[PDB]
Symmetry: D2
Subunit: 268 residues, 4 copies
Amino acid sequence: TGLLDGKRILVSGIITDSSIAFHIARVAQEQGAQLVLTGFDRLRLIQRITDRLPAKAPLLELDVQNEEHLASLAGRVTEAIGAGNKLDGVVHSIGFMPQTGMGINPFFDAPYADVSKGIHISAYSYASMAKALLPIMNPGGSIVGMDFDPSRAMPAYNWMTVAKSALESVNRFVAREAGKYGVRSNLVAAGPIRTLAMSAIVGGALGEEAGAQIQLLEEGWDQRAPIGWNMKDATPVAKTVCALLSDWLPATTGDIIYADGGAHTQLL
Amino acid sequence: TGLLDGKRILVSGIITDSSIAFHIARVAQEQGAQLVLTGFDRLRLIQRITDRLPAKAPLLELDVQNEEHLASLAGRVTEAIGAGNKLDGVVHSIGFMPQTGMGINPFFDAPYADVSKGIHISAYSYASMAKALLPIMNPGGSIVGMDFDPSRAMPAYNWMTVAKSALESVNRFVAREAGKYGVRSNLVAAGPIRTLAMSAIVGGALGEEAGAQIQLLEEGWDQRAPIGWNMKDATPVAKTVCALLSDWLPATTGDIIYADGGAHTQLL
Amino acid sequence: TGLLDGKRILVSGIITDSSIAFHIARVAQEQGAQLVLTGFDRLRLIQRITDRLPAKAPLLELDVQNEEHLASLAGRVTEAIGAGNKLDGVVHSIGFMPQTGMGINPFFDAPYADVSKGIHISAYSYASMAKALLPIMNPGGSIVGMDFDPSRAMPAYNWMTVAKSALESVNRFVAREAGKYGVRSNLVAAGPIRTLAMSAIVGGALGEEAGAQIQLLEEGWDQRAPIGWNMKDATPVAKTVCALLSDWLPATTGDIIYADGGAHTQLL
Amino acid sequence: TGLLDGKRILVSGIITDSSIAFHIARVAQEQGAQLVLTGFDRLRLIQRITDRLPAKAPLLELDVQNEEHLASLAGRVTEAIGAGNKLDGVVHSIGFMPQTGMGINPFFDAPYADVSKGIHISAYSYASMAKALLPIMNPGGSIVGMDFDPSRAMPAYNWMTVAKSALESVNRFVAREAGKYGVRSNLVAAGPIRTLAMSAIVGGALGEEAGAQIQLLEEGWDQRAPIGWNMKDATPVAKTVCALLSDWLPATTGDIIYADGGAHTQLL
Ligand SMILES: NC(=O)c1ccc[n+]([C@@H]2O[C@H](COP(=O)([O-])OP(=O)(O)OC[C@H]3O[C@@H](n4cnc5c(N)ncnc54)[C@H](O)[C@@H]3O)[C@@H](O)[C@H]2O)c1
Ligand SMILES: NC(=O)c1ccc[n+]([C@@H]2O[C@H](COP(=O)([O-])OP(=O)(O)OC[C@H]3O[C@@H](n4cnc5c(N)ncnc54)[C@H](O)[C@@H]3O)[C@@H](O)[C@H]2O)c1
Ligand SMILES: NC(=O)c1ccc[n+]([C@@H]2O[C@H](COP(=O)([O-])OP(=O)(O)OC[C@H]3O[C@@H](n4cnc5c(N)ncnc54)[C@H](O)[C@@H]3O)[C@@H](O)[C@H]2O)c1
Ligand SMILES: NC(=O)c1ccc[n+]([C@@H]2O[C@H](COP(=O)([O-])OP(=O)(O)OC[C@H]3O[C@@H](n4cnc5c(N)ncnc54)[C@H](O)[C@@H]3O)[C@@H](O)[C@H]2O)c1
Ligand SMILES: Cc1c(Cl)cccc1NC(=O)[C@H]1CC(=O)N(C2CCCCC2)C1
Ligand SMILES: Cc1c(Cl)cccc1NC(=O)[C@H]1CC(=O)N(C2CCCCC2)C1
Ligand SMILES: Cc1c(Cl)cccc1NC(=O)[C@H]1CC(=O)N(C2CCCCC2)C1
Ligand SMILES: Cc1c(Cl)cccc1NC(=O)[C@H]1CC(=O)N(C2CCCCC2)C1
């Protein structure tokens, strides 16, 4: 009697135990889902990480910039879940921007080759993955991607902000395509989560000013959030993704659900 | 093992079996919730209607323009659910605008006394009800109100649109207050639902042009919605309200969830 | 060869020499406009204030809660500008909320009678004034009102925020009506301007916490604004209103122009 | 005594006499501006076209994908306007998406190489051009780019919609950089303008369904616009760009001005 009992769900984006996708996978399994995981490049690492999940789940390789991986993905998923079975859910939890595109590196100095690679991985791939998986998704199914509200500019996030603006637009078009299959497509806009890399940025990995700016953003976020915001706790975000994967938001698509403590609704 | 197992939830706004709140109440009971209902003016009618719900629920009188009713409400609710028990949820499903404020009656001809009464009932009362009930709500609780997206003007909806714009603003302030209690506050923006009164408007009750315009809006809504929109089915809306009443959107507050088929995300 | 050469423009909302409308009137006259002014209650005061404007302008009494004043207004304006002449512009620079609706007074404690009076004056009156004046406006004309961005909640502004949310909605409907006359309707959303009353609030007139919160908002606004924000200078706002009154934004209506230093486009 | 008397303004994006930039250039010259034009690839054609403008203006080559052209641009502009003179304005009126990214070609079938080229030209280049020209812009100056509202998905516009979503985000970051120079950055979101290429699309150049869909969008736009919308008249758009280039919107930056008849403010 879990929220996702019987559902077959693909989850991308695990790379460490602090990955938002690790917590999405954990909560989905606690609620009865059967998972297929996808991982990029370091598959030995990812397998060792996902051994800590509450249940076993097959791990498939997927580099979203690799056309061969995308073309073979549905077949590999079907092999893993059994002929005649389809997916009920897909989680896109993938993002990347080269360091020239973030941090104290000036906005104008990011070469377009770098920005293009960030937009490929962070925005276009939401459409790539939907293209690959919709043919093996059931009616009533759900595609969910992770967003960070890009409606306003901010220090340091720079071209990643642009990539998220693109992703939000991509999501509204994926909803048009997915609708033909009876499938919903939505994003969860999360507040800041202190992953490994974010702690590295606070420690100055992308420059001192950038670290300082992110600490100020984190502090302000919890202040503005009427119910507070705990950057060390991804569980509320994971629960929100599972809500979208369930049968309980059946008339929402092309849309963005804010799991951010309510901060974006408050000026100060 | 229902979505709302053990939760005590107040539901306002039932007046007929086509009321959106009737379907919210039905689905919440199917998912294990224990309800207290509130009704306006025709309590004999409302009792006979709610006899058709799957489980029994006490009915309390509440005119939101009546200060005495509001001042006594928490005590009456506590009497109904038992001393030492509090509410986990509150549903505001209340709206009203005099006929001078809607339909073919010119926008400029609505007297302010009429508009004020519509705004009192449709917007201010969301704050009134929160004031009354927050002192008897548990941490983790949820206040939900019904919205119709007023971001753009449209024919005939006229001053009711203005009242909804006000309600959206009220909701962001109620979230600030509710947050002190560990309680969330959100609206569900539903697509058009063919209630009794809406069928009456399509039949020309507020003028012929108004009826024609609403039929065009309904048709366009289903067209734009990537997953379609069934104006005769309130269940998807009721499910969305129950999602917000559950524990599965714990980091959303001051916000608006669109249960509209995705229509507001598509231009055409 | 001023921006507004030959145009006849009604300007409401002057009460002191720090009124935003005083600066709108000054700049409009510097650019060639012929004005008619309207004033509320203290007409002797207002006349003495407007004697300092660069050119003479007739002053008419207008209490927007007074139906007789509204019903007679067009005739009084026509008397002042001459039979056979019409207005090219109207400026609404009127707002009010009782002190129970702002400041440290709790949001839930504002009586609806108070909120209703604030919404009447601050939102409904935009429609009242358009109703009164559209019959004596020329094609190509422009109605402009003053807004403070209410898209997010904030401390202390409380029910005035709600009134502005209502005003934004009203403006989109006034645009529908005005369009029949070839007239545009828009709002200017200004950043914070340190008028007499705002200095009084910073000095604690609506409670100490409220004053502290407004000083923080002011400081943050200038920080966020990419071109800065000078709360002591209403001229940039006045220029923006004159831009809307001119012939140079002929395809904008139902809309909001932000004269806020760009602050609403930046998170921090 | 023109709106732009004495101002030196760079205008990009002319390719035919139906180019929106041709009308921007014409109106700016009618209002006293001194222009420098930039053109892509067919410079003989562009020179013959711009011979029809009311005044002479030097034409410089600029392919925004060409790094050498960008690196040399400021020097070439300075050579054209005279050492010791700087620009007061820059107009970005550049867009491109390969045909795989628009029309009836399925959204999922656009190769990323194609999408990337569209985003390079249509979005990244707004930042490229600002980088190149800000060092030779005066305080009080203005950078303006052309937008088509991408807040909602729509048929056929497909990946160009995504590129515009990216451009809107880019504009908010360019505003941060430009602010250091005392320069504003804004976009004008225009309604549909029947250029040569758009007539070609209506005639079926990107598929029959796409042409049909654009005709429906055009018709609906004029219907929704409270003051109407004339797709054959770029002058209202050109005037709006000149308003932003003038001194009359001095507190607007990082923002979007809608020159669309008010259509985006109305649902129907
Ligand atoms: N951390 C936050 O503050 C935050 C906030 C809101 C949204 N998000 C978003 O959540 C998502 C997950 O981020 P995270 O914070 O968990 O970081 P993460 O580093 O743990 O996850 C990013 C993932 O993207 C994967 N990835 C990179 N290149 C790839 C490629 N070529 N093919 C496939 N996968 C590839 C990485 O392997 C990694 O698993 C991202 O979309 C991020 O933008 C993060
Ligand atoms: N029907 C739709 O298309 C639609 C769409 C979106 C949102 N909504 C909203 O959903 C909510 C419920 O509307 P509905 O369509 O179910 O209509 P409804 O008529 O069934 O419900 C409106 C309720 O408000 C109650 N009410 C009126 N005055 C009251 C007062 N003084 N005190 C207390 N209650 C009072 C009525 O008794 C009734 O129960 C409203 O907020 C409405 O604006 C409706
Ligand atoms: N000051 C700011 O920070 C700021 C920022 C953005 C928008 N605004 C808006 O600008 C407008 C003007 O405000 P201001 O700051 O210049 O203050 P102000 O006090 O100088 O102007 C408010 C005006 O409203 C008038 N008014 C009140 N009740 C009236 C009635 N019954 N009939 C007619 N007029 C009536 C007052 O006489 C006064 O002239 C208001 O809409 C305000 O909300 C102000
Ligand atoms: N036509 C409309 O309906 C409409 C509506 C809103 C916005 N817009 C926008 O207005 C702008 C101008 O479009 P238009 O309709 O006048 O079409 P247009 O074809 O006349 O202008 C597009 C211009 O981009 C130029 N361009 C393409 N690749 C380039 C490159 N590598 N380097 C430099 N310039 C390059 C072309 O030469 C051309 O001059 C675009 O941003 C477009 O997206 C158009
Ligand atoms: C919010 C912020 C600022 Cl202001 C400055 C720098 C960094 C951040 N926050 C992040 O980068 C967060 C949000 C986000 O999309 N990611 C991604 C995580 C995966 C690799 C690319 C970045 C991590
Ligand atoms: C959408 C629409 C148009 Cl366009 C014109 C007229 C009516 C409507 N739709 C409605 O009025 C719907 C949406 C809404 O808030 N209610 C309320 C139902 C309760 C009494 C007041 C109106 C019913
Ligand atoms: C921005 C702010 C906060 Cl946060 C708290 C209190 C006050 C304010 N700012 C104001 O009230 C500004 C903005 C505004 O509409 N007015 C109105 C001025 C006329 C009388 C009613 C208020 C003055
Ligand atoms: C609005 C629309 C639809 Cl719905 C479908 C197809 C085309 C369009 N409209 C356009 O493409 C308009 C708006 C726009 O950015 N351009 C650009 C003109 C320059 C080359 C790339 C496209 C022309």
